[PDB]
Design an enzyme around this catalytic site. Structure first.
Site, PDB file in Angstrom:
ATOM      1  N   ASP A   1       0.847  -1.140   0.000  1.00  0.00           N
ATOM      2  CA  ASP A   1       0.000   0.000   0.000  1.00  0.00           C
ATOM      3  C   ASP A   1       0.886   1.192   0.000  1.00  0.00           C
TER       4      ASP A   1
ATOM      5  N   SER B   1       3.403   6.188  -0.826  1.00  0.00           N
ATOM      6  CA  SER B   1       2.515   5.643   0.091  1.00  0.00           C
ATOM      7  C   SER B   1       1.342   5.767  -0.788  1.00  0.00           C
ATOM      8  N   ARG B   2       0.768   4.601  -1.194  1.00  0.00           N
ATOM      9  CA  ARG B   2      -0.364   4.516  -2.103  1.00  0.00           C
ATOM     10  C   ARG B   2      -1.459   5.097  -1.263  1.00  0.00           C
ATOM     11  N   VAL B   3      -1.463   4.658   0.020  1.00  0.00           N
ATOM     12  CA  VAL B   3      -2.156   5.215   1.146  1.00  0.00           C
ATOM     13  C   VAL B   3      -2.041   6.705   1.215  1.00  0.00           C
TER      14      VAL B   3
END
Lengths: 167, 509, 466, 480
Positions: B346, B371-373
């Site tokens: 993520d 941070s895909r988050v």
């Protein structure tokens, strides 16, 4: 485990894996031959179409077959291990293998005790002797025929090539 | 057939009708043992996934319940076992003892404190056979977690419950990084930061004991070890053991999560596991696929990794935060296992040697560090400066791209570089560098408002320390405040700035 | 029939079924199984043994166990009450909003319409993404294969498309999260609920969610796909409703299949890749289309194993495509969102006819420009560049600009981008490029085209640069 | 009970029925299952019969009785498939009910003899200038259509097919080419459009479409060509000219491999089984251009290969390559440019194309081909700049997009123009425009001439002067 009685003849695996079970089994209690013979007997109690027809045939697909030849046919006097080992081979399909298992066995009190020399001159009559080069001349009173099946033709062969072999 | 069972001790009695043995269903006799796969004859009623115990005190697990035998993965070494041997079930699958009396331990993954306490064993055990939580059970990762690494905490700011890949090469300070965090968690754990009562789980996969030994020593030193399990599967190992280790940890950490607490697992690394496991599969014959790896190495992991999450309320809201590690080799990413991991993780943290040579430890490829988050993993404090900074760095880098014809082309870009460079100085960090946010933002602040941009790059660092010692000394007030307001509050900023300018003035002059 | 687990060697559960067996596929329920552990007979392994697949966890299972054939394959709830439900493979609300009481259950093997039975014609839908429409226009029933990286915004993009479309298009949806990232489903959940695409006030939505997460056994992950597939046909034919079928990820489906194949002690072909790789697909893909009773339009995510496409799986995939969007990682990396490849972000079904002949031509010209331009890249790459000739240099720029212009901001990731997304009217796009084709943005630089909507805004943006 | 002609499904993989019994079955017999399915007792194992199941089951459950049909496969063959979409069993998925084909013929029949065969001399044309020109082509001939995806590929086949319309609907007995499109693994949709398309285009009346769509069971998909093949021979041997377009064998192969593997009959290179060249070879060897005994007939094979990234080194492609009498290689970049044709010309090949085609075209084409070479080659000199000019003109001229087939004469005409550099005196865009106008101009007027040119089989010098003049008049006279 239980140390194993591997007296050859036998075949070492190949229902020597089986055989050797009975080379320890039969062997203990020394029903070696007793059973050796059970099997012989059995064999042909098999070899009629009990044998083809359901025996080595599953068309029922062995599943009930092995649960009815455990009891309709394995139902016998041949049973101190004899039917029980059958009842082992059965599921384990080694019914189709049996001649050879027996073979393996039978070569035991019958022929463990055999004979074997085979040069190019020989091709032994395998008679049952625990000792050698004796019987091996009695053979010359045996000697009275063949295409030299048991013991050989040494004519085309030995000799016959030789002229060739020089050129 | 399988000449096994044609063992004429085996056969030799079924024949007879002289059979009856070990159990061959709840115990088995080892048909063969070789390969750590103890074909153990019998085992019928045998539980699946069951841990068994060998007549060696070695454990095994009943992987393949074959109708005849069990392909049993051996929890030991089979120089310590032999053919025929009776394997008695333990009846049960794996659970690992789980609890809390592990925080302060180096154990082997078999939960025996190899440290030298011996097992300060958990009363409870918790299934490694346990699986990932559901959708609904989860409620979003939002809880930050900041490593005390400015760069990280800002740019790939870290949430909790998460699963973020640590990727980088041969101890490129990788571990160094992990430590600085760990030390960093100390203050929260020295806080009674119940939100960040982050129990650290160090899964050591394959590390030779000495590697562990400094490290643990370090943890000890960081005393962070106190809230820490070190699950240790060293180089000296049977493979499954290394394999097992994450899963073990996995049972353990989800417990914290679910007990509202925060668990942190570092899987270091699944690269070794994967290999091992694959190998294990392969040794099991059990497929390979791409790169010789069985396809369910994904499943393996995927399943492993779904078990890390940031939970909803039912679970006390807690987390089991995963910082998985994969150590790259040449950034190999179509590297199947990387491919996978990427799609799972993520976001991912790229480490770069050059930067490292540049001294830049930490060595990060920021561009890729993602941070895909993203936003969920932060704090406004950081958000307020880091937002701009990250961005500013983006440009800086873009323009580090575009820095070689003269960068004095437009002012901006020269600037971006100067500024950038300043920030660069800031983002390199020593080894053993946990950090507090207010400083971090402070330090960032300085730069993003360019004050440091009015300073020579060498002195940036110099400032940074100094500035830190300065603010630590005086503006302890403020540091308190940024923490208090939880952000950089505009006031705190004004004081801060004011400090900066003065400090800066003091630093520079 | 009841069978006995004779082998569980992993989740290949060999059950010898003993009151006979039914045929393959027939779903078995394992007796003594905690939950309903359906094993799907997969093969008659023979000898009244089946090789079956467990889709549940098998841990702790006493072997020798007794399985009672559920006597048919798996059936799962069907009917509208499934929209706004997250169903697992076996129906079972993993929405966990309590049951989905449906009136219909369906065995997940749904079928393909014979030739005569399917609307033999196409449509042209559109999408509002410049890049898309221009290069791969849309249609209905069409399965689009989407390559690239989830959360580059590959995955995001899908959503965005959903975001405008499901709402806008009535004709229902299926979302299949095959090996779904549970978490991603969660967040998304709060969002959907919120979004009112998912309505919970009404069990329905406009869209049914199927999540078959990674942590499920592959069999389950593999099979969740048919399940969803079954549904859309239900919606189409039965419900009219023209599903947009989100598959994320058919490759993950596949993976579950291959993995399975292996275990199925079959020969799963080159690269380990399942023998049946194609058949699984064919049979499946054909269960998708514009029948007469509607269209199941597929938005098919294909994340690329080891990121290669020469990879047979994608090779297969291609056979069923209707449009393909191959995101370029290079492009993505070039800081371009959309991440497009401008060479197989395609529709054969772009034709002067299907789109404007202009649309098309303009596109061909564009397609050309890019195509030529790429050619230069190599050269440029080696050799510096500048003496090629300027017109080309112009194209080059134009291409880059075009690139940048294809970069089209997105609101849903405005959060990240700070870029206000743009869904673009067709004209602006066509124009956009035409203008560019007219090369008007002389002076105007590359980045003036980055992440805009309608082309004016780029022109504008150059101005904003100034 | 026959376990010697009938069997009980011992195990069924899911498509390979290991069938206990069947023995007396002859090798490669179509059997029929107690799932109503068909099978082939392909593998006569010394125990059981690997029966490739020609069907889809979950109907089969073990023990199912597998019945002989007692027949080695034949397929209905005929000539009534023209206007028919069929499946390989000879059933007609067209849903035109069932076909008119009725004679049946073993698909297992093989390659014509040399003497039965008679070399190509017989043209073959597509209405696609580039093809007909640059491939000099006869009928009987294998020419690989090789390319990745309809990228016009499929279009390509269509324009040709459509082109045959004028001929088959012409009374070109010789150019009465029965088109056999074996659609192998194609989506139904694709086919749908296609089917529709062709139908709309109606080449279809003189056309078989063998349709094995994407779903279709693999041996079937596999089988379909052989089926088609039998059917095309049906024309061939019957004097007529069938064209089978094997579309596409990549998919067949796949299926086939898969099939093999399921028979656990080994893979080979790229996991693909060893006979696979052979596979096609035997198949395609059954294609021929015959002698007179066969009415001189032909079965022209346009096999299709879909490459994966143009990779042909690829064992199977190489295989195929080594068989074909050339290839039509398609290159994307030009397509993508919009250039249709998109071809990589270099890669498109006819080893000795010219020995079975037409003077008309030839007269302009040889020289032209060369000019284009020169034009192409050189990665200013007035010459070269010229070649380029020309070349580009000619590019347009060979550019006929998808949906553009033609009578030949039209083609030669325009080509002639270009080879006279007439076109070089025009902006390249307006070549195209011009060409359209021009074409309708000659169509209008010099349909006379075209009729004649078509008549002479060659271009007459005389015609040339008229033509020159025509062209020039149009040229000049619509040069703007």
């Amino acid at each position: 485990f239980a140390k194993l009685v591997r007296p050859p003849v036998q075949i070492y695996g190949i229902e020597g894996r089986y055989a050797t079970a009975l080379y320890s089994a039969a062997s203990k209690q020394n029903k070696l031959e007793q059973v050796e013979k059970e099997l012989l007997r059995v064999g042909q109690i098999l070899k009629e179409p009990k044998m083809a027809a359901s025996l080595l045939n599953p068309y029922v697909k062995r599943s009930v077959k092995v649960k009815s030849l455990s009891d309709m046919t394995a139902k016998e006097k041949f049973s101190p291990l004899t039917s029980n080992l059958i009842n082992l081979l059965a599921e384990n399909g080694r019914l189709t293998n049996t001649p050879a298992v027996i073979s393996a066995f039978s070569t035991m009190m019958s022929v463990h005790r055999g004979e074997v020399p085979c040069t190019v001159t020989t091709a032994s009559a395998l008679d049952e002797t625990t000792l050698t080069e004796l019987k091996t001349v009695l053979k010359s009173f045996l000697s009275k025929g063949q295409v030299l099946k048991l013991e050989v033709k040494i004519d085309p062969s030995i000799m016959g090539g030789m002229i060739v072999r020089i050129g | 057939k399988t000449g096994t069972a044609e063992v004429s001790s085996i056969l030799e009695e079924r024949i007879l009708g002289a059979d009856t043995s070990v159990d061959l269903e709840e115990t088995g006799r080892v048909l063969s043992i070789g390969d750590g796969i103890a074909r153990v004859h019998g085992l019928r009623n045998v539980q699946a996934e069951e841990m068994v115990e060998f007549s060696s005190g070695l454990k095994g697990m009943s992987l393949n319940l074959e109708p005849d035998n069990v392909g049993v993965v051996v929890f030991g070494n089979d120089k310590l076992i032999k053919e025929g041997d009776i394997v008695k079930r333990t009846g049960a699958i794996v659970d690992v003892p789980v609890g809390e009396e592990l925080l302060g331990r180096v154990v082997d993954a078999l939960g025996n404190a190899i440290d030298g306490k011996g097992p300060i064993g958990s009363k409870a055990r918790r299934r490694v056979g346990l699986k990932a939580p559901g959708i609904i059970p989860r409620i979003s990762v939002r809880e930050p977690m900041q490593t005390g690494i400015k760069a990280v905490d800002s740019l790939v700011p870290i949430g909790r419950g998460q699963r973020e890949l640590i990727i980088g090469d041969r101890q490129t300070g990788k571990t160094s990084i992990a430590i600085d965090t760990i030390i960093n968690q100390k203050r929260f754990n020295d806080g009674t930061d119940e939100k960040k009562k982050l129990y650290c789980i160090y899964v050591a996969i394959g590390q030779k004991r000495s590697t562990v030994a400094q490290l643990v020593k370090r943890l000890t030193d960081a005393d962070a070890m106190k809230y820490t399990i070190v699950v240790s599967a060293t180089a000296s190992d049977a493979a499954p053991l290394q394999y097992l280790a994450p899963y073990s940890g996995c049972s353990m950490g989800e417990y914290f999560r679910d007990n509202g607490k925060h668990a942190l697992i570092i899987y270091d690394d699944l690269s070794k596991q994967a290999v091992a496991y694959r190998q294990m599969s392969l040794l099991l014959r059990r497929p390979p696929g791409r790169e010789a790896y069985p396809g369910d190495v994904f499943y393996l992991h995927s399943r492993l990794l779904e078990r890390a999450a940031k939970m909803n309320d039912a679970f006390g809201g807690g987390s089991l935060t995963a910082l998985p590690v994969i150590e790259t080799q040449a950034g190999d990413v179509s590297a199947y296992i990387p491919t996978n991991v990427i799609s799972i993780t993520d976001g991912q943290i790229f480490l770069e040697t050059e930067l490292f040579y540049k001294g830049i430890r930490p060595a990060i490829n920021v561009g890729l560090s993602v941070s895909r988050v993203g936003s969920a993993a932060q704090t406004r404090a950081m958000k307020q400066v880091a937002g701009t900074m990250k961005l500013e760095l983006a440009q800086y880098r873009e323009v580090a791209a575009f820095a070689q014809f003269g960068s004095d082309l437009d002012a901006a870009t020269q600037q971006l570089l100067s500024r950038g460079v300043r920030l660069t100085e800031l983002l390199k960090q020593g080894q053993y560098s946990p950090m507090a946010i207010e400083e971090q933002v402070a330090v960032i602040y300085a730069g993003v408002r360019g004050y440091l941009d009015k300073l020579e790059p060498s002195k940036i660092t110099k400032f940074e320390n100094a500035f830190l010692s300065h603010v630590i000394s005086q503006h302890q007030a403020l540091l308190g405040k940024i923490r208090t307001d939880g952000k950089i509050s505009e006031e705190s900023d004004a004081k801060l700035k004011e400090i900066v300018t003065n400090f800066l003035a003091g630093f520079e002059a | 029939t009841t069978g006995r687990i004779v082998a569980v060697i992993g989740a290949v559960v060999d059950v010898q079924f003993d009151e006979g067996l039914p045929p393959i596929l027939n779903a078995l329920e394992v007796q003594g199984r905690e939950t309903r552990l359906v094993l799907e007979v997969a093969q008659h392994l023979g000898e009244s043994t089946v090789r079956t697949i467990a889709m549940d966890g098998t841990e702790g299972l006493v072997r020798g166990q007794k399985v009672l054939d559920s006597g048919a394959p798996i059936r799962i709830p069907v009917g509208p009450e499934t929209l706004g439900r997250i169903m697992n493979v076996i129906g079972e609300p993993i929405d966990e909003r309590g049951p989905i009481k449906t009136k219909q259950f369906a065995a997940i093997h749904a079928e393909a319409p014979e030739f005569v039975e399917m609307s033999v014609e196409q449509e042209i839908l559109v999408t509002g993404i410049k890049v898309v429409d221009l290069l791969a226009p849309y249609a209905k029933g069409g399965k689009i294969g989407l390559f690239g990286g989830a959360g580059v915004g590959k995955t995001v993009l899908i959503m965005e498309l959903i975001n405008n479309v499901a709402k806008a298009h009535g004709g229902y949806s299926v979302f299949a999260g095959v090996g779904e990232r549970t978490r991603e489903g969660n967040d998304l959940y709060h969002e959907m609920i919120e979004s009112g695409v998912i309505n919970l006030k009404d069990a329905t939505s406009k869209v049914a969610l199927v999540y078959g997460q990674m942590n499920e056994p592959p069999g389950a992950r593999a099979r969740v796909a048919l399940t969803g597939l079954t549904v859309a046909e239900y919606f189409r034919d039965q419900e009219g409703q023209d599903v947009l079928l989100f598959i994320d990820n058919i490759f993950r489906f596949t993976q579950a299949g291959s993995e399975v194949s292996a275990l199925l002690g079959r020969i799963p072909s080159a690269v380990g890749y399942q023998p049946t790789l194609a058949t699984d697909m064919g049979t499946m893909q054909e269960r998708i289309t514009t029948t007469k009773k509607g269209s199941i339009t597929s938005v098919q995510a294909i994340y690329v194993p080891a990121d290669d496409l020469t990879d047979p799986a994608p090779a297969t995939t291609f056979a069923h495509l209707d449009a393909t969007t191959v995101l370029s990682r290079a492009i993505a990396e070039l800081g371009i969102y959309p991440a497009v490849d401008p060479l197989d972000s395609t529709s054969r079904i772009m034709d002067p006819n299907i789109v404007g002949s202009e649309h098309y031509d303009v596109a061909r010209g564009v397609q050309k420009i890019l195509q030529d331009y790429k050619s230069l890249q190599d050269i440029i790459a080696i050799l510096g560049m500048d003496e090629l000739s300027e017109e080309d240099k112009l194209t080059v720029s134009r291409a880059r600009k075009i690139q940048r212009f294809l970069s089209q901001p997105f609101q849903v990731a405005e959060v990240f981008t700070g870029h206000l997304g743009k869904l673009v009217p067709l004209k602006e796009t066509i124009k956009g490029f035409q203008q560019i084709l007219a090369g008007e943005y002389d002076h105007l630089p590359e980045q003036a085209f980055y992440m805009v909507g309608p082309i004016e805004e780029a022109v504008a943006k150059a101005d904003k640069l100034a």
